[PDB]
Amino acid sequence: KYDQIIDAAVQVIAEHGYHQAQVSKIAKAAGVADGTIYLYFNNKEDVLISLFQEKMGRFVDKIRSQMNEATDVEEKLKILVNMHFKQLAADHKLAIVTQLELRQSNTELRLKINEVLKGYLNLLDELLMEGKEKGYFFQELDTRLARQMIFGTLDEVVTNWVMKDCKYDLTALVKPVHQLLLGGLRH
């Protein structure tokens, strides 16, 4: 019942956009009464934020599990890149939500979205610190800048794919993005 509301919210926000999405449309798409939505969510903002928290929480947990099992820090990065691309290539509507509708100019809304994103960003920080401690990455590497390079590059590749109607295979870019982030531009 909570899960069908989450699913419906993705659908409705992707189709109509966040500002034109009404919680009543979400309830109709979920097969629930207007009132069933407010048992879980104070309102429409709490719907967008909760949907993001739910999807991010599950993503981060899966990546952490898969990484905790990997043997090599470069493979841990690959896992992260692969899961980021795979999960969105699996759900075009959630990609429209992440790439397009969670990008808000409202200051209070923007700050709440960013707080949810810190879960992913902190997992990057952990990976970067691990790679510096273990010697895969250079000692002087600036963790925060590197996080911004990794997340900013991944997010930019995904956005361009969404902007091109998801018409090529996003998952075919895992290997070259991973190689580019490890090696940089230089010959």
Ligand X SMILES: CCCCCCCCCCCCCCCC(=O)O
Rounded least distance, CB 114 to a second copy, Å: 7
Buried b (16+ CB within 10 A) or exposed e, 64-89: eebbeeeeebeebbbbbbbbbbebbb
CB of 109 closer than 8 Å to CB of 45: yes
Half-sphere exposure of 164 (CA within 13 A, CB side): 12
Interface residue with ligand X, options 100, 117, 121, 149 (CB under 6 A): 117
Rounded least distance, CB 140 to ligand X, Å: 25
Q: Which two structure tokens, joined as six digits, stand for 126?
A: 């952990």
Interface residue with ligand X, options 113, 121, 166, 181 (CB under 6 A): 113
Terminal-to-terminal C-alpha distance of the chain: 54
**Contact map string, positions 81 to 120, toward a second copy, x by CB under 8 A:** -------------------xx-xxxxx--x---x------
* Contact positions vs a second copy (CB under 8 A): 17-19, 77, 100-101, 103-107, 110, 114, 128, 131, 135-142, 145-146, 148-153, 155-157, 160, 163, 173, 176-177, 180-187
* Contact positions vs Mg ion (CB under 5 A): 155
